[PDB]
Each structure stands twice: as structure tokens, then as C-alpha cells.
Symmetry: C2
Subunit: 97 residues, 2 copies
């Protein structure tokens, strides 16, 4: 089910090009949404499940909603030199299909 996920991660993995060992909170969104399936969503899946559609150029169409953050909040941390820093809208605080 689509919901908010929470874990402690090293800021050096946040891709913010930051050097630092500090487990900080990082929340995000994931889970299923197949239950938010519309009539259109149902027909697309039916066409795809029968190979009735030809693959559009690129990535395959997705036939249900996507669990995605709807709200956000900053992520603070102590760097290598022990100084506080903050990156806005980095962690999610609410989700939705």
C-alpha cells in the first residue's frame, strides 16, 4: 500500500555532493496504487495484457497511479567540519496516488 517510508541514511548517500557521516531522517513514498485504478486504467491494462497496443517510443505506459510525495520538508545535518547545513524540500512528509 502507498504510504510514507522512513529510514536513517548517511548524508553522503543523498547525492548532495556532501561529505558526512550523520544518519539523518529521510522519508519518501512507495507502495501499490492499483486500487486507484480508473476505467481508463482498467482498459489500458486490458489492451496491454493482450498486446493490443504497439509499444509507444520509450518507456512502457504505466496503468495505475504512482505513489508520490505530495508535501515536503527540509533535511538538516552536521557536515564533516561539524557545521550545520540544510537542504530544502529534500524529504517527503505526505504521499498519495
Amino acid at each position: 500500500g502507498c504510504r510514507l517510508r522512513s529510514q536513517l541514511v548517511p548524508v553522503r548517500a543523498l547525492g548532495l555532493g556532501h561529505r558526512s557521516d550523520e544518519l539523518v531522517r529521510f522519508r519518501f513514498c512507495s507502495g501499490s496504487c492499483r486500487r486507484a485504478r480508473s476505467p481508463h486504467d482498467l482498459s489500458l491494462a486490458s489492451l496491454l495484457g493482450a498486446g493490443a497496443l504497439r509499444p509507444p517510443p520509450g518507456s512502457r505506459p504505466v496503468s495505475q497511479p504512482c505513489c508520490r510525495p505530495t508535501r515536503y520538508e527540509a533535511v538538516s545535518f552536521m557536515d564533516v567540519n561539524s557545521t550545520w547545513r540544510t537542504v530544502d524540500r529534500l524529504s517527503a512528509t505526505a504521499c498519495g496516488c
Copy 2:
């Protein structure tokens, strides 16, 4: 890239309990949204990339937006008894990340 997709498909593949020798337009959304990534999406892909986030139960989280339909329009056809019918909100008329 995230754009509207248009094809001709048999109503029978529409999965709606109808057989019909009638091809009908059916448009849908699909494509890359790696362009509309949020800052949270970058730190997210990085974490997953570095394997610093442990797989939440079920479906893995998307690190970017999903191309999805924003408006719909009905799909009409002539059923086996050559009788006109329509199904509201069956086809996409606009997409968005």
C-alpha cells in the same frame, strides 16, 4: 518523453465485455519524466543507487514522476447488434508528469 499516445484498437480488447468488429481510437500517456525530477527525487535515486535505503515492503519506489492522463473523453462504438454505445472517461486527452 511524456506525451499523449494515439492508436486504433478493437473494442473487444478494451476489456469491457463487448465483442465488436470496430477499431476505435484509444489515447494514453507514456514517456520519460526524468526531466521534471524534484530534488527529493535525486537524493532518492542516489540512496537507492548506493543501496542505502532498504527495499520497503512490496513495490520499489519511483525516483521520478509518472506520465499520467489529466483529462478523459468517452469511447463510442457500434456493438455486435450494430447499436451505438459509449463509455465515459475511457480515453486520455492530456498527459502530465
